Symmetry: D3
Subunit: 141 residues, 6 copies
């Protein structure tokens, strides 16, 4: 199971206490989850190279519990792509998709450059397809 999607899949879950949560609070939390999955996959130092298609689908209010999930989608020789999803749940009554993004993470050698990365191996058809999509987005750079 090392270097598979299920091995590094991670989530965080937060109680967020005008009235709605800033995009920045959400972005930061999305980057932490992606960091966590990058970290589980690599076991080295890890840093955000770029972030694409941060889309806020709709607002998040005070007293929601948000579930920030991450799954690795694709790896090049020296980079990891991680899809991050954000769901929001009211503490009284249902679950809705609030944000999503693709993070590309990099692992740095002692001179601050990307180094060879363990390769993600897509096992299911879902994973093979997301890998293929990841490859596409990466070649667009």
């Amino acid at each position: 199971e090392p270097n598979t999607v299920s091995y590094s899949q991670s989530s965080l879950i937060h109680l967020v206490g005008h009235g709605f949560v800033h995009g920045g609070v959400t972005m930061k939390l999305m980057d932490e989850v992606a960091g966590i999955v990058a970290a589980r996959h690599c076991k080295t130092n890890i840093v955000t190279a770029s972030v694409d298609a941060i889309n806020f689908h709709d607002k998040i209010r005070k007293g929601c519990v948000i579930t920030i999930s991450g799954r690795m989608t694709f790896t090049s020789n020296k980079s990891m792509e991680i899809e991050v999803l954000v769901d929001a749940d009211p503490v009284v009554d249902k679950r809705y998709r609030a944000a999503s993004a693709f993070f590309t993470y990099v692992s740095l050698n002692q001179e601050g450059k990307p180094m060879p990365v363990p390769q993600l191996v897509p096992e299911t058809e879902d994973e093979k397809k997301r890998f293929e999509e990841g490859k596409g987005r990466y070649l667009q750079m």
Copy 2:
């Protein structure tokens, strides 16, 4: 299925940043989850009455993600008992139980005094078990 364990079963997941985390930080996070399961159960504004047997099974190190899970175990007339379990998951390199506590919460009217509490019905045998034991601790008040 309101007023069941499964109904208000709640958890939070936190990346531990800056190694040991001092008990105080964990306790606070345990109260957060406890608050959430209580608000889901009774739907009123909510306050902690007492906490018992906080056990730190062992230390929580930086770079762990902690799952803080909470389930209701028993309800008295005016009070609720809620078990909170903390699990620690190192990201590099082993998952273990880090802490546990029984929180007794109290539902308040819009002045001061605590109002009566919606009853909790167990369904599985283990839920039956836990309720007795819950019952038990209460009695010793």
Copy 3:
């Protein structure tokens, strides 16, 4: 000169405390500046719709002061694009571009849906340029 680039041109400057700063922190600060240029432009209460092409050009180290600058580039009917640039300035010992992003913001009425947006008029050639390119990215929606 309301509704020009110069009108709502905004920036923040932060001392980085405790070395790399994780992408998440910078992203949040980029959103803060983006929010400020948008509120200056349209004067309504303001929310982030999406963020694109967040590029981390390279790492931001502790003991840097970062200039986070934001200028509006283009306005659709209901949306605004805002370029945010992050510059890093070590205090001891070299200044460099650290990150850049295009934020699309949205002006909201006092319920939910986004209201129409005050148009942006470019004046210099470079502003003309940037607006096209802005226009461009929008189209690809």
Copy 4:
């Protein structure tokens, strides 16, 4: 005076700024005071082993100054018990007891296990009695 109750007695005093202070904020602060007294008594690394009878006597509101006092009550060979009290004072007009708890602290050797602890010596009748009570609570574990 080393290893006596008066030597390590400590307090912290905080201005706390729906309207009432969460149990978690109070618990955390109680653990810090107990940590401080454990630290004064030992002069080694120090960690919470367990917490018993956290009782919230009544609420704490914004703009109260809280006095969190700690006194060591009992020591076994490898553990310290510390009573923590929390008083709340309004900034205009009087002082009331808000919370109390017993913390048991441990000192860890380089392999993460409790090590021999300096022994508390109760000098007054009050201290001898609290020691005896402490011994009782400890044997209950």
Copy 5:
């Protein structure tokens, strides 16, 4: 005994976490105590007018508990002077004076301008002393 030094004599005690603490942190905490003694004295909403002679006698290290004490020294018609003293107490291993300042505070009406201030009556000789000197500094405005 309202409007005496003893009436509004206030202090806070803080555990310094993460070694030197930068002046800024201490200054902020000195203002907090100053605010508290002023609110106790006049009972109106309260704001700092100026601070003088902040002296850092020497450095405040991590793992110190600091006592920040404040007493009123003098009242003009519209203003109050308040001396704040900071004491530092290492927990392991020596207690010393770390900083001192004279804060002049101002009582505000429910619009803008500062309202008149309740007079302060000294009683001990040292209080007499301090009031003159207080008087003195004011005059030099």
Copy 6:
């Protein structure tokens, strides 16, 4: 340009989110800017020795952007004086002077005492005059 006023001139710019900003928040931020200029001038460890004439000219409200500027004014053999200015700008419509102060910074040797400091050289008439004023304030200690 090393050791001139322009070389170490620094600023920070913050979005501040009863309704007005505490003097303490402002003081802290003023000390950070002064620290930054002291740091640019010295390239060694740096600490606040004292602060004089913190004057709050008028209030700062939520949703203002504040510009905290620092410029070195004077150096003795072993100390640096830095003038700090604070301007406040509403996010809708103009700029006003909110606070000012003189910080004196010191650079410490390994035994915690001030060490010889690079000398500020005033190049313009404005700078020569502020130097002279700085010398005056310093001899008053």
